[PDB]
Automatic annotation (TrEMBL), chain A:
Any one GO MF annotation of this record: ATP binding
One GO BP: peptidoglycan turnover
Positions with a binding annotation for Zn(2+) 2: 213, 217
Chain positions recorded as N-acetyl-alpha-D-glucosamine binding sites: 68, 80, 106-107, 156, 159, 189
Keyword terms of this UniProt record: ATP-binding, Carbohydrate metabolism, Kinase, Metal-binding, Nucleotide-binding, Transferase, Zinc
Signal peptide stretch: none
Name the record gives this protein: N-acetyl-D-glucosamine kinase
Gene giving rise to this polypeptide: nagK
NCBIfam families: PRK13310.1
Amino acid sequence: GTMYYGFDIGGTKIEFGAFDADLVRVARERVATPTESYAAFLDAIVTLVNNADAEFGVKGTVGIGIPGIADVETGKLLTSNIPAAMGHTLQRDLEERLQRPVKIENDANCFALSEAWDEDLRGEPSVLGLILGTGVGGGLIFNGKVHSGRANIAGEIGHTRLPYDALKLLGMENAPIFPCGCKNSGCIDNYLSGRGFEQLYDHYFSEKLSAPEIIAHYEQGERRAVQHVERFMELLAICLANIFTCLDPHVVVLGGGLSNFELIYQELPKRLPAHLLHVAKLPKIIKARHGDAGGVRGAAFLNL
Amino acid sequence: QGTMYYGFDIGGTKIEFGAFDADLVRVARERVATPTESYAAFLDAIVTLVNNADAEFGVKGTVGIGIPGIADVETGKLLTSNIPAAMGHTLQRDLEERLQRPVKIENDANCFALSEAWDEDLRGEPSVLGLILGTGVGGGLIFNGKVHSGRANIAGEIGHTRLPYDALKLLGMENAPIFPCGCKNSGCIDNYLSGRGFEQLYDHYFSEKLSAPEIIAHYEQGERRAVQHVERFMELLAICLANIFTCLDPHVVVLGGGLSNFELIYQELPKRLPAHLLHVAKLPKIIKARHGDAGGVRGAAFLNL
Ligand SMILES: [Cl-]
Ligand SMILES: [Zn+2]
Ligand SMILES: [Zn+2]
């Protein structure tokens, strides 16, 4: 009698999934995201919900994942990649049209919640999801529920500054201080992401290589790539140790392009203990399992 | 039988006990000596209080215990240097056996935060961060009225995170004071943002060893050095907290410990935090603890709500 719907809103496509009481996906639909019209945007979502409700014979719950946030006070979307919905009160408008509550969360929160509801992680008291891509995105799950935060920006771990011990590793007053898109500076977003991995390589070795090129060189034993990787893994361990001393997560799930670098899962357990408290224990650290289905899954799971 | 929630606060010399009914009315209060050596005597003191209360109220009460330390999450052994009688013992398992019911044991800073989070004004807040600013920085993370203990029972050890880059910049980067830490790391914010940290920063910059109350009294008199120290301290506090808040985004932040009595904190933080937060961020509500150093019992009891 219960169905959970999830929408993942991208700049060009809206993805839809319906999950039964056992969290098995029983419907999948994809429609175009309207480029300009808000009215068309609402219709696309309302239509999907009404059709699914007719199909499954229930009134499904509605969760939506977005590349941005809803302003916690006004309900207006801050989603620059979705011009049709930018500035609009999406939740209120959908609640009125669908006559039921609607939840809207940032895509990184949906990613973490999706991974936290994997059979292997169900019942974990806390899960931290980190996406290491062009930036660092984070999602904090406690007892299977997203912690959104006072202003819907819990998990913005990427916009915390390099800690003293990370600065020390990188040469203190000679460390590279990368400018940040948030307009602060030295945010870890610019060090631990895939882009950060690249920028650190370029800063020290004066050659602009992509992460896969660096990794391929690493595997060939090229000395510059080997030195870069050594520095990167220690830097990652120091920064995550700082984060883990505050959050002490039970499981850490990595997504984004850099989570494909398998060496991470070998090196973190070896390097974290030196930077953690003496009594600390290591979280389980794994690569994301749900991939492209993450956005829809986590959005749906907002209403569990 | 009715619900009854018991809480114990274990200190080095006293064990404090409280019972709270379904409405969270306190219906018992007892204080007994903490045994100095005997583990047997330690267990008896607790078991006695539980059994007497159960008989008196006609209930089987839930049992929560706040300790100055943690239980090892794997072995159950207590890591509590201030309590030599219980140090190294499997307190939870031993009490569960004697009392035939589950027992929850949590660090005292978690109990402090949970106690505050269950005040009428904060009930219903989706998240509460408690920070105790005393001889060190203690922290407690509450989500939806429940303690997040962490993978190894040390969630909230915010005091053992290192100064962020922006804090170091304020303090002079390569010339900043790097204080050694009891955890054996260095530059942990435990040694900057606590009452002791406030004192050590004053001494580093002004070459005079004053207590926090002396500095504050001089601040209130408009003394130049104290005014400069307070300006530096408030900005340092805002920077470090803004970093913490960018990760945690707590709805409410509750300050305890001696330094939470410095009223200026509550005025200055809202003014200084925005520059270091994300542009879209909003300020948490930041308040002084309501229940003082007498919420260990409350928080311990509330572990079982
Ligand atoms: Cl799925
Ligand atoms: Zn930033
Ligand atoms: Zn420390």
